């Protein structure tokens, strides 16, 4: 009977509502706003874990580590733009050598 399940979500509608009330964002908060916001957060999280799960089996580990999240963010054009000024700790960089640096 929780709001999450009533909206068909894993992310906590109730907690998102409290964080919106207490974050000094506006006098009042509609009922659908935490639902809509919870759904966007769950979708972006599903999108990243989708690709980073892939990066992890493409490497023969059960377990997503920060390097996998970095590879998933940076090889996807739209997630890379969204996280353009963000540093993933222990993510390293994408392998990339300028053509002119290569031999022969």
């Amino acid at each position: 009977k929780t709001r999450s399940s009533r909206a068909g979500l894993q992310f906590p509608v109730g907690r998102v509502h409290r964080l919106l009330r207490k974050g000094n964002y506006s006098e009042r908060v509609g009922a659908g706003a935490p639902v809509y916001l919870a759904a966007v957060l769950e979708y972006l999280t599903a999108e990243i874990l989708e690709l980073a799960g892939n990066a992890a089996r493409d490497n023969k580990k059960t377990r997503i580590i920060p390097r996998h999240l970095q590879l998933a963010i940076r090889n996807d054009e739209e997630l890379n733009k969204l996280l353009g000024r963000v540093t993933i700790a222990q993510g390293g960089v994408l392998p990339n050598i300028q053509a002119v640096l290569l031999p022969k």
Partner: protein, 92 residues
């Protein structure tokens, strides 16, 4: 005591990849991520309601915030999911 999103990030991970787990550090990275996007959308929602002299943040402000912040396809799917969740929530 000390809230984070770990439990819900784990639930979404099993949905998309039942076989796969996640390390402590990588969980901390997803927590940063959720908190970042939350504050981006909520702050943008906040300014939208203020620019329009409204005291309520409704799902319509959240949607315009999402349109302004996410780049293109991310925006279309995010707007679909939110619209769906509000519908399903309202219905039952």
């Amino acid at each position: 005591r000390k809230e984070s999103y770990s439990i819900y990030v784990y639930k979404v991970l099993k949905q998309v990849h039942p076989d796969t787990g996640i390390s402590s550090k990588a969980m901390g990275i997803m927590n940063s991520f959720v908190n970042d996007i939350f504050e981006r959308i909520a702050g943008e929602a906040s300014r939208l309601a203020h620019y329009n002299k409204r005291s309520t943040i409704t799902s319509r402000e959240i949607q315009t915030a999402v349109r302004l912040l996410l780049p293109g396809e991310l925006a279309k799917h995010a707007v679909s999911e939110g619209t769906k969740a509000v519908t399903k929530y309202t219905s039952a």
